[PDB]
Design a protein around this ligand. Sequence first.
Ligand SMILES: OC[C@H]1O[C@H](OC[C@H]2O[C@H](O)[C@H](O)[C@@H](O)[C@@H]2O)[C@H](O)[C@@H](O)[C@H]1O
Ligand SMILES: [Ca+2]
Length: 760
Amino acid sequence: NADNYKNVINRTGAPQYMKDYDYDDHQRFNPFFDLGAWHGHLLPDGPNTMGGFPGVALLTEEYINFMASNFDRLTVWQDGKKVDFTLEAYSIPGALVQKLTAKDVQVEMTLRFATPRTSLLETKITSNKPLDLVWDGELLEKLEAKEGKPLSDKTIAGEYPDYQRKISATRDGLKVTFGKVRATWDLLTSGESEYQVHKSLPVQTEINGNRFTSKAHINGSTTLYTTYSHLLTAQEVSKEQMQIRDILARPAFYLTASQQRWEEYLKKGLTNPDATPEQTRVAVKAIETLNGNWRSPGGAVKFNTVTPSVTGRWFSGNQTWPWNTWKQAFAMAHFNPDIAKENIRAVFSWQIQPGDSVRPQDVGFVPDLIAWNLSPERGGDGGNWNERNTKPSLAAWSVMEVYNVTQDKTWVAEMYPKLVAYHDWWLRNRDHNGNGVPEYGATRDKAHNTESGEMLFTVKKGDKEETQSGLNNYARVVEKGQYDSLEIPAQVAASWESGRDDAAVFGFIDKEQLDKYVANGGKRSDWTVKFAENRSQDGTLLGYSLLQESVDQASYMYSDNHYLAEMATILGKPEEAKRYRQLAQQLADYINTCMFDPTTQFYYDVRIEDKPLANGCAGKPIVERGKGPEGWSPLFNGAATQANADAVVKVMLDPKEFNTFVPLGTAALTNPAFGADIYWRGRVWVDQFWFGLKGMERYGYRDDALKLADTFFRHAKGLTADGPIQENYNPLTGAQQGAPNFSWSAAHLYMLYNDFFRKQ
Ligand SMILES: OC[C@H]1O[C@H](OC[C@H]2O[C@H](O)[C@H](O)[C@@H](O)[C@@H]2O)[C@H](O)[C@@H](O)[C@H]1O
Ligand SMILES: [Ca+2]
């Protein structure tokens, strides 16, 4: 029951700036969103906010921007005298609650969500005499701050002259109008968006520039109702009036709907009886977090989706990525299965079709990033929407977990063809050596190449830049190697497509570390990831590949074939299933044979060397760039043989390798590029962690995973505090880092609850 879980996350705070950013540019507060709505609310922290839920957070299509600190804050007056209240404020799963206590008057305010654009406040007043009610509010003025401190003296209206915010009174409340602003990286409004306030009683309203006062009289105890609605289009504004009228006409129905929606989340969700109360509350933090990141249809995205973080700088709006989607939907299938199915649908709703007007050669491609606004290339003015690359595909796994939970045959029939086209695209456009095993890469694009299809790249040295074109020139410039750095947009995009930005296995390594690598007898060339282009037989360019085959990528492909075979068998396709089992078999054979080094007893990526080996392997395992989580991807995805897996677990459990203060980080201590505070070269991510625990388990090492889970739990910082879920942990110290309310950490924290956490 909800009440058992008060203040799981700290949702207090009084924003002072539109961008009230923390150190990494994320909104430093944690607003309550639900039902996919495009606004959210914080709790009051003291006297100045008491009587209201401060911090109206607006989701301006692709970003989170605060509107007001105080907005619709109640204050109570009896015989011209202000009533003095003391405050209790708390969140629960699915609602914010605050109570104001005094001698002769008491107020109970409960804020829940009614529709995907409209939240509902219930104000329950209890009094033995008549009362005068004052609500007040004030829009924000100041622009930007970091850690509470201002970065400038810039004002919101200065920065956006065409915003022209205007508070206006109405027949049953007030409203805020917003002018058109197309600040592509900051603030995005249609020109007809609004924040509407509607009340269940007549009120009298005074507007004073960018603040308001509103008054009313009541005879005694009474429960009144208020709607708050952020609406982004003229068409939304019209289509809501009707739904506001039905909420005020029957509030209890909507409270009850929400109230019940959440009891069912918690019921379906909290299914591990071995878990401790502390661990069960971590699971609920994740469910809240995950549900908060759920957005309803909005702009170009016709489905309900889930973003990496609603308070994130670049993860807000309905901006959706396939990678974290699979992880999110795997977890949310175990509690909010409806929206898990929609998240998957949303990612596949812009899958490339035959005859596409941008990339007809990318059929099956699933974009890296979809959002409210399409790219100029597709008709919109969006700067985030991205088809430079996809991301690593665990689609079939994620789709199969929803079916595991629901048993819905029609779900599998819906998805199968979407997945098969994605599978086919990998093999056609990401297998430079037609050898059956994928590379990470990039697509053909404005940013990657000329209109002739000649790959762009910039050569840098000292203060000198030199943009050039063509794979011929690129090859040469690399051979000579007379540059400080070499920027290839297409190669930059394949690091995105890898899922890891700074990774050792893709050649990234700081001066001082590389120097010690050389002093230990390495050559600098060992860290140079070559790059090539994929052409059809017709000579058409299809994209690019890293001249390197990644072991995680091959493992995910094994999974893809594995699950597509089961899906095929379920849909009564025995011959398509036999073919996927065979592809799977060839991938396991290639992974074990080509990517496992018996010497160091672990898996690694392979180079696509200029000529293949005697055993069909495109190259030798890239052991010289150290070990990392990809090493146990074959265990997780089930590609590994019992023996090879036995070896990998030996390494994983070794204190000098991956078994650290927080285990299973993103580079072993023995990696040459290792850095404890480096995101993808040391720091522990919960997904990788969990892939690893599952991997041990699958090959008989459940009790060892349970140990590591207990270590993770005792050591990972803040896990049982009330702070938002973040991205990763330093493996030596436990410090958290990365964006608050990070979905996939929630996805996988939740699954750690479901699989491995227990009473010790
Ligand atoms: O938009 C493509 C990109 O989106 C996500 O990364 C957002 C990044 O945007 C800027 O590069 C910013 O400076 C970074 O700090 C921020 O993480 C995603 O994580 C990438 O994989 C890629 O899809
Ligand atoms: Ca290949």
